[PDB]
Amino acid sequence: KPKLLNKFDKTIKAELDAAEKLRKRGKIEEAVNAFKELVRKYPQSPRARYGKAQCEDDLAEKRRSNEVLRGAIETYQEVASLPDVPADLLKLSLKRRSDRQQFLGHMRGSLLTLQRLVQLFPNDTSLKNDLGVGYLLIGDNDNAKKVYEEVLSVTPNDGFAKVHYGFILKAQNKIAESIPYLKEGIESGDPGTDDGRFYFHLGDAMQRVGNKEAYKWYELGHKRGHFASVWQRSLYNVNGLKAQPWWTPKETGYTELVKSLERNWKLIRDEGLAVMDKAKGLFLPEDENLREKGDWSQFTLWQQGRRNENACKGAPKTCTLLEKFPETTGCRRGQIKYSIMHPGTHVWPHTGPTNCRLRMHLGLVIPKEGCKIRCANETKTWEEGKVLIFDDSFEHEVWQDASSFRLIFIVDVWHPELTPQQRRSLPAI
Amino acid sequence: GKCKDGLGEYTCTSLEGF
Numbered sequence: 001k002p003k004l005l006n007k008f009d010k011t012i013k014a015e016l017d018a019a020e021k022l023r024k025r026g027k028i029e030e031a032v033n034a035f036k037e038l039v040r041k042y043p044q045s046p047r048a049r050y051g052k053a054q055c056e057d058d059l060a061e062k063r064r065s066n067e068v069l070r071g072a073i074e075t076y077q078e079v080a081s082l083p084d085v086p087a088d089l090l091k092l093s094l095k096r097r098s099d100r101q102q103f104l105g106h107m108r109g110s111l112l113t114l115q116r117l118v119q120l121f122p123n124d125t126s127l128k129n130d131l132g133v134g135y136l137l138i139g140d141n142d143n144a145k146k147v148y149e150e151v152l153s154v155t156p157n158d159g160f161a162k163v164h165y166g167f168i169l170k171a172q173n174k175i176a177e178s179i180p181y182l183k184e185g186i187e188s189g190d191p192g193t194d195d196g197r198f199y200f201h202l203g204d205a206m207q208r209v210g211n212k213e214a215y216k217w218y219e220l221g222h223k224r225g226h227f228a229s230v231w232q233r234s235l236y237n238v239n240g241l242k243a244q245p246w247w248t249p250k251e252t253g254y255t256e257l258v259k260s261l262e263r264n265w266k267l268i269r270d271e272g273l274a275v276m277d278k279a280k281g282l283f284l285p286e287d288e289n290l291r292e293k294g295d296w297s298q299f300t301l302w303q304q305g306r307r308n309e310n311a312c313k314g315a316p317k318t319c320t321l322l323e324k325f326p327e328t329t330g331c332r333r334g335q336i337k338y339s340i341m342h343p344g345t346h347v348w349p350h351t352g353p354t355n356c357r358l359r360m361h362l363g364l365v366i367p368k369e370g371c372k373i374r375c376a377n378e379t380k381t382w383e384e385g386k387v388l389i390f391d392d393s394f395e396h397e398v399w400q401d402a403s404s405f406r407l408i409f410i411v412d413v414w415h416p417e418l419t420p421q422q423r424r425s426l427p428a429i
Numbered sequence: 430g431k432c433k434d435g436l437g438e439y440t441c442t443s444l445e446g447f
């Protein structure tokens with residue numbers, strides 16, 4: 001289909017095609033320098049410059065270097081510098097620039113690439129979609145929302161924009177309003193709408209409102225490969241890790257840790273209690289919108305495997321005791337933290353991001369009654385000085401109906417079946 | 430914004446390269 005040859009590029013179709021062939025047959029190095037020759041002899045040719053860029057890209061794949069890709073990106077901008085660039089070639093060159101700026105993790109820039117793409121092509125709805133995405137990658141949810149509002153303003157049965165509008169509404173606690181957009185987006189079956197996030201959050205929205213075929217949705221997502229199961233709904237997974245809601249210390253082999261937690265638990269408690277009496281600001285409320293009602297706060301010592309030095313000021317002996325167990329301190333997919341929950345609190349059913357971690361709870365201050373946690377179908381109890389364990393990748397729910405506070409200590413560990421390679425490599429969460 | 434106990438953010442990892 002696409003027309004990537006302007007007037008002057010047609011008079012050199014042969015040369016460009018010769019060099020394209022070299023690239024297309026795998027000889028990258030050959031093609032790279034042929035397109036360089038084209039570009040010096042034809043320094044305004046948009047096709048030759050796209051040629052240079054495309055083969056820089058293939059060579060970043062060749063070498064798996066991100067140097068290379070860094071370079072192909074300025075060359076993709078180069079192509080748009082030039083005169084009389086066919087619009088097709090223009091769109092392609094800048095889209096690729098944005099896509100590889102995301103593959104490398106440069107979102108602020110991808111954002112400006114995509115803003116410029118939307119300026120240049122104000123009737124393409126897909127660009128406005130891909131721009132709403134670029135806004136979500138940086139966490140700029142307001143502007144994404146507007147972008148999807150425009151899009152829907154003018155093509156209301158666009159399912160991509162529906163699901164993303166829904167995801168945005170949900171993340172803002174507009175649970176009801178988000179349900180119809182999520183549902184319509186998914187069933188639209190458009191490109192971009194078959195995505196685990198939308199299933200996950202549509203189901204959660206229903207459970208919250210009291211609608212019963214949330215589970216509908218969860219099992220279909222199971223059907224289409226997003227969820228390992230209907231109950232285990234994490235999304236940043238390593239397939240085939242043993243999955244079970246509840247483990248025992250033995251089942252994890254982390255027994256030295258469990259022991260060091262149970263034997264030393266009063267130290268841990270007492271340091272938390274101090275932080276609650278003299279340094280209560282170190283405890284920060286839960287900001288992930290997981291509560292129906294109530295008061296819940298968390299005092300975090302390790303996140304993503306990095307120790308919080310100011311935080312360990314208030315629990316030094318605890319942080320010192322944990323240093324000797326890298327199976328949690330270097331769980332870049334978990335945390336170590338005090339968690340206080342007060343009476344009147346209900347945590348919606350929910351699921352963590354990842355099956356890569358197991359979650360350990362050491363009872364510090366646990367009332368006689370009121371305090372319980374379901375995971376899957378089994379409901380359990382904390383105990384002062386003892387450790388519970390579960391896969392928070394499974395659905396789980398919590399209540400706190402006692403008459404005083406409930407303090408636990410959360411320690412996340414790598415899943416036991418995960419290599420030292422997987423442990424050093426997996427991107428942090 | 431990070432995914433600590435749930436899955437609220439659009440993307441829970443921050444890509445950086447190969």
Ligand SMILES: CC(C)(NC(=O)C(=O)O)C(=O)O
Pocket residue numbers: 339340341347359373392396398408410434
């Ligand atoms: C018990 C509860 C809410 N923890 C979780 O749900 C979890 O660790 O995933 C907590 O009070 O901290």
Ligand SMILES: [Br-]
Pocket residue numbers: 041042043044045
């Ligand atoms: Br020229």
Ligand SMILES: [Mn+2]
Pocket residue numbers: 350351392396434
């Ligand atoms: Mn939880």
